[PDB]
Design a protein around this ligand. Structure first.
Ligand SMILES: CC1=C(CC(=O)O)c2cc(F)ccc2/C1=C\c1ccc([S@](C)=O)cc1
Ligand SMILES: CC1=C(CC(=O)O)c2cc(F)ccc2/C1=C\c1ccc([S@](C)=O)cc1
Lengths: 116, 115, 115, 116
């Protein structure tokens, strides 16, 4: 599994469950093409977005739909979403975990990049 | 000053100086329109981006060119840029400070909305 | 002002106001000696903790009473307090800003060391 | 496993390996008694610190030895260590993960608390 997302909720001290995530890849014409999407599980994790074969070199945007997550919990958050934009596989195949920590007016995102 | 940006460097423990920042507003057709830009000062701050007259309710994107910042320090970063997308509202508090803390493989962003 | 503290609230997007802060210096016997204290202002800041004459090289602990802050907002927090421990050095930059971002089950702290 | 530590390195985008961790518990006389210690593994994780039986109600301090970690990588960091202080098991047994993200002049710590 070459592309990982893991989301935590800094208000509840829990995984952030059912968080929608949309992945895009920059096309040759410089537009964002839809690449993959999904929702975090009970554990706050999202696996199986892509395969090594399909996950080629490129610039990727991981959109984490934070506003919808917070709204459902009765909180009016600041951000529309978190977007994490990065070049992937530009030195051969890697495994990426995008880790996000969510508060209503703040978020952090960290990448864990490993060589399999 | 309705909209300020402050950027800090978590590796050097300093303001992040000369970081390019580009602000966009979402247009009716859902495309991003350039709105304002600048570079952070020696205090890591960017002021005078817009005015209260111009800064109307709407969706905005603040783009922070973190990749160029790290490259100028000889450090290989993960992100192309940091991206902060939000709705500006007239209701609640109306001075917006977008704060950002930068590491090569991590960033955090916080909004300070005051009266 | 050799040592400043700024505290932000990540739930409300505001300065963290009236947060008690206690500063300690490590004594020769490795015990913590009270050094300075105060409460954050309406801007979430604490100034005038010490002077350049008094703020000598040594190990310091800045304790931020986050638990009481959350309790006053009716929110159940994880931590007893935030704890920031560091060596003050004369060599490098010498205005220290201890910045802290608070969530109920999370906090971040950053040091801004300037010239 | 009722007490978890997981540490990441925000400079290298990797787990923080061989990070020393010391756990203390507040005694009846208000002193910090040594409770458990260990080092993060290749995955940045530390397991097996304690057992449900030994992990009773109390106030705990998790000290993460960040300064030694950074020094070995040739970086002079700001903090001596991270200390995470919390009441545990004060409403019955829980499982705790203390998650830390490290930069030379900054750190964050989040708790993930689950009911088994
Ligand atoms: C070690 C670690 C993990 C691994 C895990 O949970 O399995 C993690 C996962 C997430 F989804 C979010 C954060 C973390 C984390 C540390 C951490 C990161 C950012 C912050 S922000 C900058 O306040 C604080 C702490
Ligand atoms: C109080 C505060 C300020 C205000 C200031 O210093 O002027 C600030 C400005 C920034 F550009 C970035 C962070 C902070 C901050 C606390 C803080 C925020 C995020 C993190 S991340 C999530 O580790 C950690 C600490």
């Amino acid at each position: 599994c070459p592309l990982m997302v893991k989301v935590l909720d800094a208000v509840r001290g829990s995984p952030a469950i059912n968080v929608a995530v949309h992945v895009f890849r920059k096309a040759a014409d410089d537009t964002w093409e839809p690449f993959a999407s999904g929702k975090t599980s009970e554990s706050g994790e999202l696996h199986g977005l892509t395969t090594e074969e399909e996950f080629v070199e490129g610039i990727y945007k991981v959109e984490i739909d934070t506003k919808s997550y917070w709204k459902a919990l009765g909180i009016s958050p600041f951000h529309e979403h978190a977007e994490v934009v990065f070049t992937a596989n530009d030195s051969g195949p890697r495994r990426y975990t995008i880790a996000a920590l969510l508060s209503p007016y703040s978020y952090s995102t960290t990448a864990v990049v490993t060589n399999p």
